[PDB]
Amino acid sequence: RVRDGIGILTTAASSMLEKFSYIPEAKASCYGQMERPEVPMHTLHPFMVNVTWDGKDLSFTEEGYQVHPRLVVIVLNKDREWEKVGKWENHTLSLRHAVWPRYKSFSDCEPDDNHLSIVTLEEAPFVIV
Amino acid sequence: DPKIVNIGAVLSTRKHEQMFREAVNQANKRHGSWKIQLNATSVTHKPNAIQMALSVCEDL
Amino acid sequence: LNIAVMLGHSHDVTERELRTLWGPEQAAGLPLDVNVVALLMNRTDPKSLITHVCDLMSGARIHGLVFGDDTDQEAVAQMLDFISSHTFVPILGIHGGASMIMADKDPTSTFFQFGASIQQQATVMLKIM
């Protein structure tokens, strides 16, 4: 993450310099006297969106957060630990379970006695896939 | 009396300062003086934005 | 183009040069002055945070700062915006407390988190449903 962020800042600075050769000067002193608006234009705020870095497509929105977050849905295991199942890369859930495993809700709970794993065979008039 | 609360404030002009003090005194002239004794301190404004946060932290 | 990074002091509290040695042979091209002035963090308080940032700002013409706090004080994020409110130095946080989203920021400042908005989480929830 640190390396990615430094790369983002460097790329934004390079793009700003390429747009025109006017480097932005830092502020005089926060602890000093009062401040007044003196920026001829937004130095690097517009130079923040639409930036790529070796495949990573972080594209912070106008609201101010990433448009492609690395979100992973997690589920509690049977040993009171957080597991990990399924990422979210472009838009797909890419889930990691074709069928949801019926998990023991508690050590003191009624047994699962209402689920039947029925089976069938593909015929013409009985089942059609 | 041993309990002493410390309500602060941040007003605009120095004169209102005095007003504030007198106000809190009324809040003790009517309500009691055993488990109370509200004590009033304040500060006045600054123009350096971050100086506001620094002053409020350090003083109040 | 001198920037600074504040670490978490908890997980990788060692080898400041290791962070300083990012992309040794070639990080991203190093256009003009790509150098790290990263410092170390500790127990964070608004007085201490403001003091450290203001002191560093009156230093080697600091630029965009990457924040990596480890603790979760929640309100810290807001405080960060406040600094970017009154000193036109862009700033972004990646890990920890400055990770939870804050929503509507002041349109006259730049500060971009790296977390997940409410809407994205709700969308992923409905997709998993």
From Swiss-Prot, chain B:
Entry PTM: NMDA is probably regulated by C-terminal phosphorylation of an isoform of GRIN1 by PKC. Its phosphorylated state is influenced by the formation of the NMDAR-PPP2CB complex and the NMDAR channel activity.
Subcellular location, record wording: Cell membrane; Postsynaptic cell membrane; Postsynaptic density membrane; Synaptic cell membrane
Glycosylation sites: N39
Annotated function: Component of N-methyl-D-aspartate (NMDA) receptors (NMDARs) that function as heterotetrameric, ligand-gated cation channels with high calcium permeability and voltage-dependent block by Mg(2+). NMDARs participate in synaptic plasticity for learning and memory formation by contributing to the long-term potentiation (LTP). Channel activation requires binding of the neurotransmitter L-glutamate to the GluN2 subunit, glycine or D-serine binding to the GluN1 subunit, plus membrane depolarization to eliminate channel inhibition by Mg(2+).
Subunit (UniProt): Heterotetramer; the NMDAR subunits are modular and harbor tiered domains that function in concert to regulate opening and closing of the cation-selective ion channel pore. Forms heterotetrameric channels composed of two GluN1/zeta subunits (GRIN1), and two identical GluN2/epsilon subunits (GRIN2A, GRIN2B, GRIN2C or GRIN2D) or GluN3 subunits (GRIN3A or GRIN3B) (in vitro). Can also form heterotetrameric channels that contain at least two GluN1 subunits and at least two different GluN2 subunits (or a combination of one GluN2 and one GluN3 subunits) (in vitro).
Annotated disease: Neurodevelopmental disorder with or without hyperkinetic movements and seizures, autosomal dominant: An autosomal dominant neurodevelopmental disorder characterized by severe intellectual disability and developmental delay, absent speech, muscular hypotonia, dyskinesia, and hyperkinetic movements. Cortical blindness, cerebral atrophy, and seizures are present in some patients.
Domain notes: A hydrophobic region that gives rise to the prediction of a transmembrane span does not cross the membrane, but is part of a discontinuously helical region that dips into the membrane and is probably part of the pore and of the selectivity filter.
Record-stated family: Belongs to the glutamate-gated ion channel (TC 1.A.10.1) family. NR1/GRIN1 subfamily.
Stated name of the protein: Glutamate receptor ionotropic, NMDA 1
The species this protein was found in: Homo sapiens (Human)
This protein's encoding gene: GRIN1
Full-protein interval shown: 23 to 82 of 938
